């Protein structure tokens, strides 16, 4: 068994990073809970609701064929061939694919499905590259791209009277190409000269702050760093005794997260962050925690996950998920589910239009060319009361929540909502405090 | 059974247009002998010789997995998935693919194999589009592209003092894009103004000559027409009483063929044609004719072919291929075989370099990235004593034989060798006669 297979009149493809990118030679690494098991389980949860929804796809049951990305393009590409296993001879009629976490993977997959006119909806890929609806015409993303985020950041930088900014992107996909967007959006706009562009892959981190203070005029540092990388730049900057000198503008990797802010409260004070308009799905919380080994067979990775989540093998007991006093939930679950809904709403819209009782031959063609024309024109309330739609390029419109960290008053300890970015920039300057 | 499968240590992919492009809805049409069965049988013949060759791949047997293109891109694309059937679980280790007749198909296939780093060698696709070694980096062609042919035609047009030419391309792939090359090669060069560009899909043909005589200054007509289309333009022009007015410059579709020249001897007189340096494989002629229904089981389409070649079902008798007094051989067989050799020579070169006794794990990786680097650096005598190689773009260098039809003397009735096009233009003007 190399996958999860739920049977249904129509089947939805799944690609999740269940396993981390293993070392050189070894294809799959350790299991990754929050990013692979959680997001995975979210789809299963989402499909459950759809299949139980009497108002949506009332006579057409949805199936699942979730597969392991293993955080590798080549791996997910060969893994995607099963979403085409029907085209050669119970046969699976894959109708669309819940696109992968990780753009470099997502592109690799958005290449076979493009050829088989299979439409795809990612939940995590934000690389501005994927917005080329010509190179990737069947791809669409339920998260917005980093370009929107960058324009938002340029908008905030522009509105505070900063024409000398600095960038600091974590070496990798998310970091580099996102900071590039900013660069280009800065070039195209007014030209808020970028002093330095530091690319970070704690001795080295102290050199980063040393290289940044090299341009002491560069007040503001635009950050596109991984979760710990922010924490390790801050600690480096506090060590550099640089409290309230730097003007942090953080990407969505930062957001309203207090974890990179522990002990780093003084230096981080007044940092600006853009978190996508997100909310936590209330129903799904009671679900994931419910899952035992005896009941949750569905998840063909759950015994593997169980041995890791609790660190065990002896492991006899199912009530164990109560042990999470060190480990909490996972964000971006709202998106996964929504992508699954974006598919289910499109299919249901395709049904009342072409069908008969249910799943007619007139639609059956596995022509996602018409379904793509439906996924794109899909505009409904999502799993958290946040609208779900796409532009002509297939990226979801970027609606954000600009936050700023404050410490002064006991009426202000934490992230304050400085403004929003629907597409026009909303930013309050009396509510701001550095 | 949907294919031919010969087992071997290493297996070579095959895609042939066994069946014509059926009507709207119906995927496969009738069988096509010369273009589907012949070319198909050539590969089988070619692989036989390689597998029997003690000097080439001496301990590594080559297998075959030939498949029906059915003259359709979508069809051949889904047909190509078997060349990847190994990547999910006797398993077949496909190493390369003998690329399809028909560029629009060839591109569609050069899209999955590109993704699976499977190298491919076409035998018939000449669309100048495929020379983009970036968009098609694993594709290579044992025939030259039409661009070479076009530059040759411009070279001949340039050397005869013609700055006013006309074009006439058959509506389709081969016709249009080839005539476009000429247009561009004319634009880039000296600018031999094109009067009209007639695209032909015998009342209509007489209108073609009517539209062509509209620019009576346009002495020369550059033709990229299908085999009968030339015959139907000539008959149209003779009816138009236009003997020795037009100056035909014919593409490789014309060549040294007397079939479009029956009764049309007077109008066609002096026409210039470019035939690729080709010769007929002596061994293979005695092979194809040998094939009976009882012996030749190998060919999973041969019973279907047999019922068509002789028009029968009653059909009891194997000695029947003697009935060919109306139907002869098939050209371009030299190319197919050569492509198969181009693969076998590359594999053998890859073996002595990486291997052990035979088919080592150190090469086994099905990484055609290194094999592509071998196919490209392959330079040997082909199946007809005509060198086989590739440029950095993967197209075989264009070596041609410029012919001209003559009728005057009984020492000259037929196509005379006016010159050659290795890359520098060779053209004799005393040997020419209109």
| Letter string b/e over residues B304-323, b meaning 16 or more CB atoms within 10 A of that residue's CB | ebbeebeeeeeeeeeeeeee
Q: How far is B27 from chain A (nearest CA, A)?
A: 14
Contact state of B78 with A87 under an 8 Å Cβ cutoff: yes
Residue pairs spanning A and B at CB distance below 8 A:
30
Distances (CA, A) of A68 to A31, A140, B240: 11, 20, 69
Alpha-carbon distances, residue B298 vs A9, B71, B286, B367 (angstroms): 40, 22, 17, 29
Q: Which two tokens stand for residue B251?
A: 């593409």
Could you tell me if B286 and B271 lie in one domain?
A: no
Please give the Cα distance from B430 to B89 (Å, whole number).
67
Phi, psi dihedral angles at B265 (to 5 degrees): -70, -40
* Claim to verify: residue A39 and residue A84 sit in the same structural domain: yes
| Any B CB within 8 A of A88 CB | yes
Please write down the HEC assignment for all residues of chain B. CCEEEECCCEEEEEEECCEEECCCCCCEEEECHHHHHHHHHHHHHHHHHHHHCCCCCCCCCEEEEEEECCCCHHHHHHHHHHHHHHHCCCCCCEEEEECCCCHHHHHHHCCHHHHCCCCEEECCCCCHHHHCCCCCCCEEECCCCHHHHHHHHHHHHHHCCCCCEEEEEECCHHHHHHHHHHHHHHHHCCCCCEEEEEEECCHHHHHHHHHHCCCCCCCEEEEECCHHHHHHHHHHHHHCCCCCCCEEEECCCCCCCCHHHCCCHHHHCCCEEEEECCCCCHHHHHHHCCCCCCCCCCCCCHHHHHHHHCCCCCCCCCHHHHCCCCCCCCCCHHHHHHHHHHHHHHHHHHHHHHCCCCCCCCCCCCCHHHHHHHHCCCCEECCCCCEECCCCCCECCCCEEEEEEECCCCCCCEEEEEEEECCCEEECCCCCCC
Shared domain check, A216 and A296: no
Computed over its alpha carbons, how large is the radius of gyration of chain B?
A: 23
Q: Are A153 and A274 in contact (CB under 8 A)?
A: yes
Question: A122 a known binding residue?
Answer: no
B332 annotated ligand binder? yes
Examine the domain organization and report whether B385 and B309 are in the same domain.
yes
Interface probe, candidates A65, A72, A81, chain B, greatest B C-beta count within 10 A: A81
Cα–Cα distance between A234 and A237 in angstroms, integer?
5
Which of B 106-145 lie inside 8 A of A, CB atoms?
108, 111-112, 115-116
Place of tokens 């040294």: B256
β-strand partners of A19:
A31
The answer on B139 and B5 residing in a single domain is yes
For residue A76, the SS3 value is helix
Q: Which of A81, A108, A116 sits opposite B88 (nearest CB)?
A: A81
Integer CA distances (angstroms), A325 to A32, A303, A331, B21, B382, in order? 18, 21, 17, 65, 73
Please provide residue A247's backbone torsions phi and psi, each rounded to the nearest 5 degrees: -115, 85
Number of domains, chain B: 2
Q: Which runs of E-coded beta strand occur in A99-185? A: 120-122, 139-141, 165-170
A220 shares a domain with A75: no
The answer to whether A88 and A112 are in contact (CB under 8 A) is: no
Beta carbons of B133 and B376 less than 8 angstroms apart: no
8 Å CB contact between A263 and A392:
no
> Cβ–Cβ contacts within 10 Å for residue A359, how many?
19
Contact B88 A85 (CB under 8 A): yes
Q: How far is CA A391 from the centre of its chain?
A: 18
Helix and strand totals (H; E) in chain B? 13, 18
Residues B55 and B65 in one domain: yes
Token duo for residue B377: 């650096």
User: Which residues, in sequence order, are CB contacts of A134 under 8 Å at separation 6+?
Assistant: none
Check which CATH number belongs to the domain holding B170 and give it: 3.40.50.2300
Domain check: are A273 and A284 in the same one?
no
B 188-217 → A contacts, CB under 8 A: none
Domain that holds residue A298: 1-144+278-397
Residues 370-389 of A with CB under 8 A from B: none
Taking an 8 Å cut-off on Cβ atoms, the answer to whether A85 and B84 are in contact is no
Phi-psi region of B19 (alpha: psi -120 to 50; beta: other; left: phi over 0): beta
Q: Chain A contacts of B80, Cβ < 8 Å? A: none
- N residues, chain A: 434
Q: Hey, is the C-beta of B81 within 8 angstroms of any chain A C-beta? A: yes
Closest CB to A77 among B78, B81, B115: B115
Whether A172 and A219 share a structural domain:
yes
Judge if B257 and B331 occupy the same domain: no
Integer Cα distance of B21 and B276 in angstroms: 27
Residues A172 and A245 in one domain: yes
**Is residue A213 located within the same domain as residue A232?**
yes
A136 is in an annotated binding site: no
Q: What is the resolution of this structure in A?
A: 3.3
Separation between Cα atoms, residue B406 and residue B10, nearest integer Å: 50
């Amino acid at each position: 068994p190399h996958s999860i297979r739920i049977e249904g009149d129509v089947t939805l493809g799944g690609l999740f990073p269940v396993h981390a990118k293993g070392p050189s030679g070894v294809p799959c690494g350790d299991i990754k809970r929050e990013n692979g098991i959680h997001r995975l389980e979210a789809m299963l949860y989402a499909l459950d609701q759809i299949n139980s929804d009497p108002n949506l796809l009332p006579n057409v049951t949805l199936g699942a064929r979730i597969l392991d990305t293993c955080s590798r393009d080549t791996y997910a590409l060969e893994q995607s061939l099963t979403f085409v296993q029907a085209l050669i001879q119970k046969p699976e009629k894959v109708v669309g694919v819940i696109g992968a976490s990780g753009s470099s993977v997502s592109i690799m997959v958005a290449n076979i499905l493009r050829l088989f006119q299979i439409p795809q909806i990612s939940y995590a890929s934000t690389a501005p590259e994927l917005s080329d609806d010509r190179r990737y015409d069947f791809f669409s993303r339920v998260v917005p791209p980093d370009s929107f985020q960058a324009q938002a950041m340029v908008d905030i930088v522009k509105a505070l009277g900063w024409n000398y900014v600095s960038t600091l992107a974590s070496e990798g996909s998310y970091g580099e190409k996102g900071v590039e967007s900013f660069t280009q959006i800065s070039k195209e706009a007014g030209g808020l000269c970028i002093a330095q562009s530091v690319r970070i892959p704690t001795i080295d981190f102290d050199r980063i702050i040393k290289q940044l203070l090299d341009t002491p005029n560069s007040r503001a540092v635009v950050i596109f760093a991984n979760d710990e990388d922010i924490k390790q730049i801050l600690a480096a900057a506090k060590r550099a005794d640089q409290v309230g000198h730097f003007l942090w503008v953080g990407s969505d990797s930062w957001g309203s997260k207090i974890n990179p802010l522990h002990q780093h409260e003084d230096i981080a004070e007044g940092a600006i962050t853009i978190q996508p308009k997100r909310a936590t799905v209330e129903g799904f919380d009671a679900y994931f925690t419910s899952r035992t080994l005896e009941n949750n067979r569905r998840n063909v990775w759950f015994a593997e996950y169980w041995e890791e989540n609790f660190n065990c093998k002896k492991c006899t007991g199912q009530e164990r998920i109560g042990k999470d006093s060190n480990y909490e939930q996972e964000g971006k679950v709202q998106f996964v589910i929504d992508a699954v809904y974006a598919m289910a709403h499109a299919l249901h819209h395709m049904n009342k239009d072409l069908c008969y009782r249910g799943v007619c031959p007139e639609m059956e063609q596995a022509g996602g060319k018409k379904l793509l024309k439906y996924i794109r024109h899909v505009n409904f309330n999502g799993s958290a009361g946040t609208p779900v739609m796409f532009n002509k390029n297939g990226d979801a419109p970027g609606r954000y929540d600009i936050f700023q960290y404050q410490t002064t008053n006991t009426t202000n300890p934490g992230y304050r909502l400085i403004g929003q970015w629907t597409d026009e920039l909303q930013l309050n300057i009396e509510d701001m405090q550095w």
